[PDB]
Design an enzyme around this catalytic site. Sequence first.
Site, PDB file in Angstrom:
ATOM      1  N   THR D  28     100.445  67.760 170.194  1.00  0.00           N
ATOM      2  CA  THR D  28     101.804  67.792 170.705  1.00  0.00           C
ATOM      3  C   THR D  28     102.789  68.335 169.679  1.00  0.00           C
ATOM      4  O   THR D  28     102.603  68.206 168.472  1.00  0.00           O
ATOM      5  CB  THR D  28     102.282  66.390 171.127  1.00  0.00           C
ATOM      6  OG1 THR D  28     102.333  65.550 169.965  1.00  0.00           O
ATOM      7  CG2 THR D  28     101.296  65.756 172.090  1.00  0.00           C
ATOM      8  N   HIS D  87     100.900  65.945 161.978  1.00  0.00           N
ATOM      9  CA  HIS D  87      99.900  65.059 162.561  1.00  0.00           C
ATOM     10  C   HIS D  87      98.932  64.695 161.437  1.00  0.00           C
ATOM     11  O   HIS D  87      98.938  65.361 160.396  1.00  0.00           O
ATOM     12  CB  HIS D  87      99.178  65.725 163.726  1.00  0.00           C
ATOM     13  CG  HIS D  87      99.995  65.788 164.984  1.00  0.00           C
ATOM     14  ND1 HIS D  87     100.217  64.689 165.792  1.00  0.00           N
ATOM     15  CD2 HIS D  87     100.648  66.820 165.571  1.00  0.00           C
ATOM     16  CE1 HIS D  87     100.970  65.038 166.825  1.00  0.00           C
ATOM     17  NE2 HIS D  87     101.243  66.328 166.712  1.00  0.00           N
TER      18      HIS D  87
END
Lengths: 95, 93, 141, 140, 4, 4
Positions: D28, D87
């Site tokens: 994402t 991330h």
Amino acid sequence: CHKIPVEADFLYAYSTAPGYYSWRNSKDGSWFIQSLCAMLKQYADKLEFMHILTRVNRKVATEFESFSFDATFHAKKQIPCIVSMLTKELYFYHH
Amino acid sequence: HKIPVEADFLYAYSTAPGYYSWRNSKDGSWFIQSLCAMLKQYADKLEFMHILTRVNRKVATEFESFSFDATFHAKKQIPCIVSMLTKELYFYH
Amino acid sequence: DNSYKMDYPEMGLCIIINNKNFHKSTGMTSRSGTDVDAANLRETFRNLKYEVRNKNDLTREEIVELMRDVSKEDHSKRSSFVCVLLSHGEEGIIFGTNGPVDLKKITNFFRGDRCRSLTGKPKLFIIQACRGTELDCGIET
Amino acid sequence: NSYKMDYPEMGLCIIINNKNFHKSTGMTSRSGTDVDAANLRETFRNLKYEVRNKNDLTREEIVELMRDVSKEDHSKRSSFVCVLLSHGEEGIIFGTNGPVDLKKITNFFRGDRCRSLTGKPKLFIIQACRGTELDCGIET
Amino acid sequence: DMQX
Amino acid sequence: DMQX
């Protein structure tokens, strides 16, 4: 409601860094524990715990070096590793 | 004579080992948000571990997730300070 | 509120698990020097007014059960908790005399939600054990 | 005892800000991270660090960036700061195209591999996941 | 000196 | 709130 994380207020005082050996002397005990006890004894009546653990990091890193008849284990060093999830300062005393 | 090659590192992790770290789309991540504020407030007075501890407290007490997905709703976070430092760190002199 | 409350009636327990002798079946040699550590620790925390309990040569099972029982104690009037682990280990692992146990399973007993009478109180784990087989050659200063 | 922080320069503050990830990775977009990056930039500028912001770096650029930085001459620098925004997994941070072991990044600054930082505080600030557990918290 |  |  007010909550706290379930992992909060843990302090892990590791004798060595992740992935490394930890060193122990047959006669004097482990570097880390002898250093930890000496720093607690000298400073627990006035220094906050993280600072005390920081003096222990310095003592282990500077005053010890391994001696070994096996060259592979000779002249090695160690740094301890403070892992803190604490949320407040820790003093082993009270006024 | 010699110092460990792993000495004098500090690793300021936003969350505990094995856990998720939370980020707000609008305000930024909980940890960075809190880190900048404590630095702003205290970097002229406090030693750096003490500042990171207050950061730990800020994240632990002032944030909690909100989600329409109950899996991720009402969750908490604690950052994780990993120090191999050998001395006190003040950002001023 | 910048400092933990350390004026509870008791400082707290200091559990010391001293593992020196290991089953052949592990290939770990006797941890000579550990009793000097265990005694040093005992006296050091006694001076800090901790209720010290020394345990020697516990199997993995005994370590788990000991920690479960301690975490089931009522620590209400104790300011804190200390556990010192003296043994062989690997990353994430401490050895019982007969084999490895995850440190996570030991510390989980004291999580804020499964040990309510230590919630909000500092929980210290002092770990003297290897975390792998890397060697630090150091650098001259 | 405390680090000497009166060298001519406080040192570098390197911020890696990864917001957009290649589809292959399937992660994402890290919405909110720009607020983070700018906040850090101003905070460290205020502490008198030489801030260098980098954005959407591949795993290759992150490793080359860290090497080139470790090869600089930090003699007149008091310290080193690296902020990772991305991330991650336990022990891993992600490039736009994939993971990199954090150890690979920090090894460039080891006391023997970066001598002009030998003896000086090296700070890594890591905003990123370390797995997928959730902390349900406890009421106090 | 030994290893743990 | 989302996850990293």
